Design a binder for this molecule. Structure first.
Ligand SMILES: *[C@@H]1O[C@H](CO)[C@@H](O)[C@H](O)[C@H]1NC(C)=O
Lengths: 49, 170, 107, 170, 170
């Protein structure tokens, strides 16, 4: 089951962005230029001394 | 705020069971505890941001070009102008929304760290002083059963009030 | 005696980005831009047809190839690299306009 | 910051005449006062944001479609593509501008609350201690006329300095 | 945070050699020093934001109109619609990105000011009290060589611990 397509198959994702096909059409996440962007689901990290 | 990577020198890789934890010492030994609220309130925020961006849209859009039987050229350089400029916008907001929601995420760890530190600073009241690395120097006797009363916020300040005001000034 | 407060940390980390610095390490990260492509075309809960050698405009004239899509009932359309609207050579006039309308015609 | 909905347990529904107020107790009674600056500096910010978004634009745009004598279809699916994608943008910024200017609004209430609290913490100096719910436990005598001197920032610390350093340690 | 333009009354126009500096007084005189870390960590941030916006794009776009041999009119009012609406977008983000990166810039000066103030508040420990304008009232003897030990964070708290606990309570 899907709701977004382009000429090379289907884009299934909960994410708001995608770097795949600008001519992707349907109920889609937005197209973006960078290949990947990381959102931290954690706190800062201080490597133990 | 200065907490994480400020005046605390570092974090504790042994604390599996929280983001935030306790670690004490007395005439018994040393033990690594955890704090549920301070860990849990922070978990509530990281996954709140998460449940936002999952909200997708109910606006559908049609294939307007053609990569088999190609359309006209004076129009391709206009659609490839609007689309290649929408590409440059959401590549700007993902540059800004993703860059910000991460910027705003680490600071929810220094305000949840000055919120657990200025509270134990108020249960103990006038019974302990702060040394430098982020601890409360206790000058009275407080064992395994006494520490756990500061943990669950049932510690009473007038319960050990006269001992530490006699071993701190001396 | 001495009591302390502290935070969690590790050394098997990824790196993220902010508003002032770039490349800082964190606890647990998550992706926001999609990179994984399912190559098939997912179609469940909706009726579908595929033309292949038939062109979308071939169901309107009906060359000897679109004889079952003369009346094709569908919620979805697929177009192929070999779709041909024509057997006796020619070309429609304002042909692409008709596809986009037909792309959304349901049959 | 922890002030509102942190270590203050709640707010005071009787304080009509400010956002922020005072509430004391002594050998006379209890009274609910207010603080003009702390209330007023916050009012300056909520209505500053307000005067921004009222700034509209001086760029005019023409009706390009037609809902009486309709235009062509290959172009409607492109204008209804650009317009229905501009719709999706300003529905993203109103999703982000409105979501943020509200996010940034409540935090101007915890920094105006740690700014009135760490100041009275400095006028009193070494003459009072903080209990837990957000008050300063006074151990000397301070009446209706003495409290109003901490209100307008004319209280002198060396004026009651030796009394509270004699009733706090004892 | 309240530091700059809160309880510090003002800044020091003589401090060429930093953003942040020291200024003391004793039985010798007065001198204006500086603090490298607190100045330098702030310089790292102002020029970090700087190195972001310099990152330009690698997407090229062609001239689609014509101001010599003009194109058609029904299309000019659509291109001048998309372009004059993209103009209105980046004039909204420059209205928001520039307005925010400046909003976020001054607050990196109140958290680098409560981070140098609550640290000297911990080296001195229980040996000084804070008056009102943003200073630490020293009640013991600390000369030109003693002050520079609080500067480079080599000051020892148990080194002058019994003198100030004898001149503060008295
Ligand atoms: C890290 O985050 C992901 C996504 O939010 C989650 O599935 C995973 O359980 C998290 N890991 C830990 C150790 O919490």
């Amino acid at each position: 089951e899907g709701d977004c397509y382009h000429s090379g198959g289907t884009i299934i994702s909960n994410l708001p962005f995608q770097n795949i096909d600008s001519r992707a059409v349907g109920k889609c996440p937005r197209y973006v230029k960078q290949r990947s962007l990381l959102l931290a689901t954690g706190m800062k990290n201080v490597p133990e001394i | 705020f200065g907490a994480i990577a400020g005046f605390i020198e570092n974090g504790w890789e042994g604390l599996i069971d929280g983001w935030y934890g306790f670690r004490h010492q007395n005439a018994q030994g040393e033990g690594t505890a955890a704090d549920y609220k301070s860990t849990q309130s922070a978990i509530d925020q990281i996954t709140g941001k998460l449940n936002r961006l999952i909200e997708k849209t109910n606006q559908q859009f049609e294939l307007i070009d053609n990569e088999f039987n190609e359309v006209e050229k004076q129009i391709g350089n206009v659609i490839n102008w609007t689309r290649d400029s929408i590409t440059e916008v959401w590549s700007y907001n993902a540059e800004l929304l993703v860059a910000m929601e991460n910027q705003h995420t680490i600071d929810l760890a220094d305000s949840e760290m000055d919120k657990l530190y200025e509270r134990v600073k108020r249960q103990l009241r006038e019974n302990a002083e702060e040394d430098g690395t982020g601890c409360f120097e206790i000058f009275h006797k407080c064992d395994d059963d006494c520490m756990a009363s500061i943990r669950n916020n049932t510690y009473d300040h007038s319960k050990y009030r006269e001992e530490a005001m006699q071993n701190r000034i001396q | 005696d001495k009591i302390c407060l502290g935070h969690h940390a590790v050394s098997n980390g990824t790196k993220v980005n902010t508003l002032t610095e770039r490349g800082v390490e964190v606890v647990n990260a998550t992706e926001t831009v999609e990179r994984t492509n399912i190559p098939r075309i997912c179609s469940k809960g909706k009726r579908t047809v595929d033309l292949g050698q038939c062109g979308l405009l071939g169901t309107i004239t009906g060359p000897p190839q679109c004889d079952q899509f003369l009346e094709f009932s569908a919620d979805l359309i697929i177009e192929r690299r070999e779709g041909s609207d024509v057997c006796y050579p020619g070309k429609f006039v304002n042909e692409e306009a008709l596809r986009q309308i037909l792309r959304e015609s349901g049959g």
